């Protein structure tokens, strides 16, 4: 709809790999490709070369999309209308590798607006918001080491508010939601599995990935509210037409979010287990966890 790239191809979060070995054999080859693309020389000089690097990468990548899913018996209309509302199409194929394409696609969508018209988001919140991609792809490239944070160029100050540019950031922002939700769902399932199997190094890396993905979602919720408050201001005009409403998420029941909170639940005993074995991630995660829950205010309706 010229506000976001549609359809946004995405995997079924239920089919996501569940253990650190199944994740690596499935996604580490395509993720490491994407990591090499987003850190090739010159790509981090400014925000412009980062967008060009994002496009060269996903262009070079052999697309894995085996078409739309279609007849899905596990999908409800509460999931479908929620998927339609933001142009999401569930796509057949390597679900983990699709998450790599969705990440590269959603990031490029965020980078277009910030190159033409900058961003009034704080330079500290801007970092964790983009670093969530570096976290996801860096960890997907090597699910057994904590991802090391790379440099993220700044954004210019917010230029002239173009018509419904806060709507472009509202739809393009919700794609980052489902991208980062699936990723954080992985690192929790791997943390749960590694903990039960006595994989202490694997538990540490998965927790580190989940935390940087949680901090990356907090910055995604600030970016969302920045565009929703700017939306609330854009509607003081009395409109003789029926006032077209911004697409909203219909309650907690969007698919990737349903999976992530189920993963987060029942992962309780693993976080306490990491804290006992001398880890420092259990503390800084609960920080990012509460920071993210607070950041729903101003973004989610039923909230
Ligand atoms: C509106 C729909 C949203 C959107 C845009 C996001 N979340 Fe979620 N979330 C939502 C609700 C209604 C609730 C329950 C609130 C309550 O019961 O008081 C939640 C809860 C969470 C949680 C807590 C999980 C738990 O307590 O076990 C987390 C961690 C969470 N939500 C994460 C999250 C992230 C990372 C989002 C951006 C991708 C996000 N939410 C968006 C509803 C909504």
Contacts of range 155-160, beta carbons closer than 8 Å, 24 or more positions apart: 155/47, 155/114, 155/118, 155/119, 155/121, 155/123, 155/126, 156/47, 156/114, 156/117, 156/118, 156/119, 157/118, 157/119, 157/120, 158/117, 158/118, 158/119, 158/120, 159/116, 159/117, 159/118, 160/117
- From which experimental method does this structure derive? X-ray
The Cβ of residue 92 has, within 10 Å, a number of other Cβ atoms equal to 17
Is the shortest distance between the CB of 292 and ligand 1 below 6 Å? yes
Give the helix, strand, coil percentages of the chain, each rounded to 5: 60, 5, 35
Is the shortest distance between the CB of 178 and ligand 1 below 6 Å? no
Residue 274 buriedness (CB in 10 A; 0-12 / 13-18 / 19+): buried
Say if residue 190 carries a ligand binding annotation: no
The SS3 of residue 262 is: helix
Task: For residue 131, give both structure tokens.
Answer: 């670093």
For tokens 């253990």, the residue is 19
Nearest residue by C-alpha to atom 25 in ligand 1: 261
- Ligand 1 atom nearest residue 214's Cα: 35
Cα(170) to centroid(ligand 1), Å? 17
Cα(65) to centroid(ligand 1), Å? 29
Q: 106 with 19: CB under 8 angstroms? A: no
Q: Phi and psi of 243, rounded to 5°?
A: -60, 110
The Cβ of residue 217 has, within 10 Å, a number of other Cβ atoms equal to 27
Q: Closest Cα to residue 267, out of 216, 194, 176?
A: 194
Rounded Cα–Cα distance for residues 155 and 279 (Å): 34
Rounded Cα–Cα distance for residues 175 and 225 (Å): 14
Q: In DSSP terms, which residues pair with 91 in a beta bridge? A: 68
Q: Which residues contact 244 (CB under 8 A, 6 or more apart)?
A: none
Q: Phi and psi of 16, rounded to 5°?
A: -60, 140
The Cβ of residue 152 has, within 10 Å, a number of other Cβ atoms equal to 18
Q: Closest Cα to residue 54, out of 101, 104, 14, 97?
A: 104
Say if residue 6 carries a ligand binding annotation: no
Dihedral angle over CA of 281, 288, 220, 130, nearest 10: -40
Is the omega angle on the peptide bond into residue 7 within 30 degrees of 0, that is, cis? Answer: yes
Rounded Cα–Cα distance for residues 49 and 122 (Å): 21
Is the shortest distance between the CB of 261 and ligand 1 below 6 Å? yes
DSSP state of 296: T
Q: Closest Cα to residue 99, out of 204, 160, 186?
A: 186
Task: For residue 234, give both structure tokens.
Answer: 């854009």
What resolution (Å)?
Answer: 3.0
DSSP state of 57: H
Q: 90 with 67: CB under 8 angstroms? A: no
The secondary element (H helix, E strand) that includes residue 212 is helix 200-234
Nearest residue by C-alpha to atom 3 in ligand 1: 300
């Amino acid at each position: 709809a010229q506000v976001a790239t549609v359809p946004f191809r995405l995997g079924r979060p239920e089919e996501l790999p569940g253990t650190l070995d199944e994740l690596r054999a499935a996604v580490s080859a395509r993720a490491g490709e994407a990591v090499r693309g987003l850190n090739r020389p010159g790509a981090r000089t400014d925000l412009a070369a980062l967008l060009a690097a994002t496009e060269r990468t996903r262009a070079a990548l052999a697309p894995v999309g085996a078409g739309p899913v279609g007849d899905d018996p596990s999908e409800s209309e509460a999931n479908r209308d929620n998927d339609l509302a933001f142009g999401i199409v569930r796509t057949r194929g390597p679900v983990a590798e699709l998450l790599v394409d969705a990440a590269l696609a959603a990031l490029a969508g965020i980078l277009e607006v910030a190159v033409d018209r900058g961003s009034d988001l704080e330079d500290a919140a801007w970092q964790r918001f983009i670093g969530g991609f570096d976290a996801l792809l860096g960890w997907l490239a090597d699910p057994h080491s904590a991802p090391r944070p790379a440099t993220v160029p700044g954004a210019g100050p917010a230029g002239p508010p173009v018509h419904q540019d806060a709507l472009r950031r509202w739809v393009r922002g919700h794609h980052v939601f489902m991208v980062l939700a699936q990723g954080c769902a992985l690192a929790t399932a791997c943390l749960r599995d590694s903990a039960a199997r006595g994989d202490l190094p694997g538990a540490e890396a998965s927790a580190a990935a989940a935390e940087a993905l949680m901090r990356g979602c907090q910055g995604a919720l600030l970016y969302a509210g920045d565009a929703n408050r700017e939306q609330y201001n854009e509607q003081i005009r009395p409109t003789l037409m029926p006032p077209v409403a911004p697409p909203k998420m219909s309650g907690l029941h969007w698919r990737d979010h349903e999976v992530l909170i189920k993963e987060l639940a029942g992962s309780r005993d693993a976080w306490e287990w990491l804290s006992a074995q001398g880890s420092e991630r259990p503390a800084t995660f609960r920080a990012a966890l509460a920071e993210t829950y607070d950041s729903h205010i101003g973004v989610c309706g039923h909230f």
